[PDB]
């Protein structure tokens, strides 16, 4: 099963999921749909902002200079270090051209962006890609929980006889079990 997990900044929710999925033997890529990369800063209305062209390592060193203490405390240096060990920089979804079976998004705004993007690409094959949303809050704890739920979902899907025929029934079970809503659509390659 070829999965993509997509968040806004490709820093937290999608990377936690990339890490768990990758470790559990899935073929996974991860992306962000945001215009730019956002990291928490000294106050909720003072995030740090970067271009997508900037390396996790560059962000690490930038934050290590700014306030070694704050960014050790709020787990951001550790997150950046984890990220670096996966790949060198965050990736924009709208820039990639890879094929997936299943695209999981980590909030409805990201779902909308993924759908807008794929629906504006010319279909050449008409091969479907399933896009599923789960709203995950952008903090380390919810990211971890969200990643394990995503892993559970991907596990189920992998055990099913026929993914397209059973995925909606599976998502409905996951809604009832988790109390969280799973938007589900298809786009076409």
């Amino acid at each position: 099963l070829r999965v993509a997990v997509v968040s806004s900044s490709n820093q937290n929710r999608s990377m936690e999921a990339h890490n768990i999925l990758s470790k559990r033997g899935f073929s996974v890529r991860s992306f962000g749909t945001g215009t730019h990369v956002k990291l928490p800063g000294p106050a909720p209305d003072k995030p740090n902002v970067y271009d997508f062209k900037t390396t996790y390592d560059q962000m690490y060193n930038d934050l290590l200079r700014k306030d070694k203490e704050l960014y050790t405390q709020n787990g951001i240096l550790h997150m950046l270090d984890r990220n670096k060990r996966i790949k060198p920089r965050p990736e924009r979804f709208q820039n990639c051209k890879d094929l997936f079976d299943l695209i999981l998004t980590c909030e409805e705004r990201v779902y909308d962006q993924v759908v807008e993007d794929l629906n504006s690409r010319e279909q050449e094959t008409c091969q479907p890609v399933h896009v599923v949303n789960v709203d995950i809050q952008d903090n380390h704890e919810e990211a971890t929980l969200g990643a394990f739920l995503i892993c559970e979902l991907c596990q189920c899907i992998q055990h099913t006889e026929d993914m397209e025929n059973e995925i909606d029934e599976l998502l409905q079970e996951f809604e009832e079990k988790s109390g969280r809503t799973f938007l589900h659509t298809v786009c076409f390659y």
Binding site: C126, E175, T181, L183, V186
Partner: protein, 317 residues
Amino acid sequence: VPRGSHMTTSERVVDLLNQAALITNDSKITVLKQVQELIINKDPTLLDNFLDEIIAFQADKSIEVRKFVIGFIEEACKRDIELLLKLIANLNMLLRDENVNVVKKAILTMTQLYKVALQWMVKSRVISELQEACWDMVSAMAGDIILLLDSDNDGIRTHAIKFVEGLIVTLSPRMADSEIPRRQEHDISLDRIPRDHPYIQYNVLWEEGKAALEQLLKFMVHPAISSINLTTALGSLANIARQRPMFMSEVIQAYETLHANLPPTLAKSQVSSVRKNLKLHLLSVLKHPASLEFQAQITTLLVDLGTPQAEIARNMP
């Protein structure tokens, strides 16, 4: 390939085929794809000579092998459409595979081959009884795929919709406001078919494209239509309206009908997923120059769906 420069291509193909024979897993596909490149691209004169040896893999137990064969049939026919004479039975048998992913692959290949067969029929100086029989087979396979809208399997139905969408487009005329994808610029369409053709009757094809649209419109109001199939059908109608704007009126009508009558079997998140795609596709059709004629109606539906006035203006001209 060491000493690859001293081999004939034929020899290398024979060696590779015996190699694939030896491989008992899906990695045989790598070898078989190399054969494909050699006999379809490097030296197409060998395509006929080796056809039966590649086609023999259609009985492989592997899903991925059978799918490779379908992809090979697709490329072979695009290289030399006359090969459809001897490959259409095989394709139709693969449409009838026990495995749903193999069947879906055959649907996707037919979405490519139907228009290629039709162009071949249109362009042909003369048409043998065998070629006539071949077109009957292609046409009947197209009809079988249309009937797959009534399959009990969701993925099969989604793929049937995409095939039906492509057929409606092929069987209707391009016009001045048609927005044609770059890859499809040279695809046959109805206006390209001479009215006085010896065999292919313009008027019959027209009625088949129309009836295919009617089947799709009927399918969309089926009370148990799935979330995915409904969103697929909505996208297909937006592509049809954009490529064939003489149907824009029917497409808008279908959107209005759905908006007033959401199938009641959709779960809550499915209703949301579908409504979000209705808005998306309405916005898309609004952007098309030919929506000028339906603008008050589209605007009204979009306001209903909670679209801000400001977002509508952004999608206007």
